[PDB]
């Protein structure tokens, strides 16, 4: 809290958690996510469902 370089990127992250799979159905996504480490990623991307 009380930053803008690591606050603002967290309220668009909170949007994502929650759009990628959230409220909305299904469709045909199947979102291919790609990353270099899982050691500095949010635990919601890390988990399945």
């Amino acid at each position: 809290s009380d930053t803008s370089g690591d606050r603002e990127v967290q309220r668009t992250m909170m949007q994502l958690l929650a759009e990628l799979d959230g409220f909305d159905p299904r469709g045909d996504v199947k979102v291919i996510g790609a990353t270099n480490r899982i050691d500095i990623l949010d635990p919601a991307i890390l988990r399945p469902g």
């Binding site: 958690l17 959230g22 409220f23 909305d24 159905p25 635990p43 399945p48 469902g49």
Partner: protein, 97 residues
Amino acid sequence: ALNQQTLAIVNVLPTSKDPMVYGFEVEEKPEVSYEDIGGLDVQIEEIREAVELPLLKPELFAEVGIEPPKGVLLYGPPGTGKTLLAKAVANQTRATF
């Protein structure tokens, strides 16, 4: 609504504000419904007492002489669930979700 030609007062509209996707979405139907009530079953119930119970049985709250809760704050670690929960409970009431 006004005639643009001459700015005549044609017929008074609806005040309807500006809800586009904003409020219009009502979904509560499957995948998540009231056959997905497998939980975490006390946690779902708590929601029912708070929410469905004053909707469906609003009079019990008079008898006792309280108000019903103002909200059910669900939180937790992600995926465990709270998208779950909220949508099943909504489907059972069938109101303006």
